[model samples]
Target: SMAQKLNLLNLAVPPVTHRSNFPSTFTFGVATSAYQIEGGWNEGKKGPSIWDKFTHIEGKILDGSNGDVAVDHYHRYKEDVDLIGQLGFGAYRFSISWSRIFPDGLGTEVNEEGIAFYNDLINTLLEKGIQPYVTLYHWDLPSHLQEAIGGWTNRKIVDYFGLYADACFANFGDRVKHWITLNEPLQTSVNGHCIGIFAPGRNEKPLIEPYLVSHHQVLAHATAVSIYRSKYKESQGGQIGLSVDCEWAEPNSEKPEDKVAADRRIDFQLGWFLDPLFFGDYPASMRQKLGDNLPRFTPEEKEFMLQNSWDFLGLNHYTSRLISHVSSNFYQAQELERIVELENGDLIGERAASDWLYAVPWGIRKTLNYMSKKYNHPPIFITENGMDDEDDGSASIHDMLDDKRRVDYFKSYLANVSQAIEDGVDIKGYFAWSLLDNFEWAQGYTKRFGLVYVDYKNGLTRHPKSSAYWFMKFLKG
Candidate 1:
């Protein structure tokens, strides 16, 4: 009765309710990726990753910094877990370094130490009564894999990645109940293969081939799901799914041209991978624009993919952008202005941290509604959502202005999610973007997004920002 009452009103009426009465299954937590924070770059039998080489190249990283010793989480995890315990959160989501476990990538021998680290980490979380949500990959491709083949771009990666998933299932499957196959797959292909701003940065390529990198990742994801389904799901009682990064994409007007462009962006960005996982084929729109660029799947492959109907859908959201079709059409994105204005006359987004991310919390609610409408209202989790701002090193990690903005962002976004839930969206959980400040890709330590501040000069000490305290109080209800 209270649940329904909490979400009964729309934006016009704000309902204040006690969070203490919130459902036990309504999870709140934080997230971290191994490559972004682990810091044992070449230690303890770990091998090189694309990030290792990319950050080393001059001019590749903005600050000429690298994650070689990123906050040393590999060694400081105990302290970090202590903070997580203190936060009184229900769960913690983290990613594994594929290179750390399968040092050379797929077929390489498993590193016992790597397995031990996670084993200990999970045990520690259990001791603290914190649920651990795990992600298998976070854009850190093993260097040897890139050297031998082309990483995700290589068609052969499909089978190799399946083995990688099997590795996690066989080892860590016992302790962790929630497993994420990949975190934001599109970022890897588009960022690494096409734009080349991230590690393994390669640019000036055909969009089709680069796009196929995503195709192979989808196959690899399906292959992994198939493995987990037949072998591990029933036995381990673990849940499997994938996470996607998306913004709300709305056409400027009801005009056919704008709607077409809006539809195209969605089909390519999110549908490219999601369609096959749910519907057994790429979005029909994709088949038309990409034609031969689309990869083919055998009957058996389609069966494997379609059958992986996912226990949950992990959504990472922060901002939104407007969509419009330009009179000028071309393969390259350079011709159009960096930012396109929608029919509403609103530009895509202006950013404080990077050009791509603009402040648009309402997008979170809109995107949730769209996915619910499209995917039959599948169970969804807000896996990552947070705003970034500079700390100037003089104040406490507590930047109230930035934190207030974040708090407001979450209020609007979660309000929208609550509205969606009322609208029949099966919203499940919400995990904040980060656990602590660590290395950010390319921006390389310049941007701090963590709720806990790390003093870079004197050991990676984590001091909870005011936002973390606010979250604790807010979630405590």
Candidate 2:
């Protein structure tokens, strides 16, 4: 029955494609987060963030690099906007720094300088005919908030986030039509709480903490959306949503158990957060496995969640994994095998700069189709999708500028995206992973995922790589 529901055989395998294949209104854009790109870590009277604290810990980042002055985009946004315009991108998806707005992550006072900075960026993008796809939070939790109230672990963050969201709507909602309440809440929960790699790092009670963190994240997202709808939606006429990241889980074998394992893997990743908003509870698989580990929503909370979830789905897909049934102490863990080779040993796809990332273009189409079927064809945006290159200093600037591998990755992935559209996925738009190479969380400056490369040694100058040119040409048609 599960196989019949998916019906992969009927899916369209699109050939090489062009922009004309998509509707004229289909958006093409680039994406970047505040903590990743905006480098005014302490400037503009901005308070410190968890990232600022995390990066200070020695050996936390691979390259011993921090985002204290990340490509200086906070000051050079005009140049970046110009680059976006020149590259023929119709939209720009960027996040606002939480600390930049409320110095202490408290709504006691507004940060005027911080407000002015985003206002200028939005105005500049609009002047160049670029729509702003604004993200309210991108993992840069203000340090004061984490210090004072234990971050997402404590439930009060829901109201605190609502204050931040209301401020953003009142200030920038008029011109910015698209708003994202949280970008990849999964990463915030898993990586930040379970793995202890991201900001406000904590691995204590890994099982319970991650679930609790995600619980608050879901509530915070719902609360923010509720405030926007009640106070700002009718007036601002904007759309708001959440960005969820997932790596496709393909059954390693056709066996019934393996298929069940694959489904469970997805239930944990996407369904963990999505099902709560849509179905009013966690996935059945999660409920059975986690039991007491997963938090339960109150009746009042469930009603609020149902009313204010997502206007659209923001999907950030990178790669796929071959999942096999494996019993472990961790309740129901699917053994995610990195498919570098087949049964006879053959590479799945060319490896990216990140060890975890492999270029599996078909994965996107499968992922889109699965989501559409599971969520009843919700309008979806490919929020963040792209591969990264190794900035190991071994390659010369000339070599780095000619990023043909990234170009190939995009070509293949975008084609699969087109195919997903053909399969009636109701796909709305696609945003390439990043606009510029900046701080990449725990990886620091070791990985480069930008179309426009930032030369850290040379006054943070930006140079458009070959992929940038490819997008420009592709979008021109």
Alpha-carbon TM-score of each model against the true structure: 0.91, 0.96
Over the stretch 1-477, how does candidate 2's per-residue lDDT look in tens digits?
Answer: 323323342234433668998889999999999889888799999999999999999988998989998888888899999999999999999999999999899877999999999999999999999999999999999999999999999998888898999999999998999999999988888888887889888887787888888999999999988998899999889899999998898887788887888898888889988998999999998888678988899999999899987899999999987777876223334444434455655555678999989887888998999999999889999999998989865667777789999998888888899888988999999999899887899999889999988887778889999999999999999
What's the true lDDT of residue 47 in model 1? 84
- lDDT of model 2 at position 436: 87
Off by over 4 Å in 2: 1-15, 328-340
Assess the local accuracy of residue 72 in candidate 1 as a C-alpha lDDT between 0 and 100: 92
Candidate 1 residue-wise lDDT at 257:
75
Residue 124 alpha-carbon offset, candidate 2, angstroms: 0.6
Best by TM-score: 2
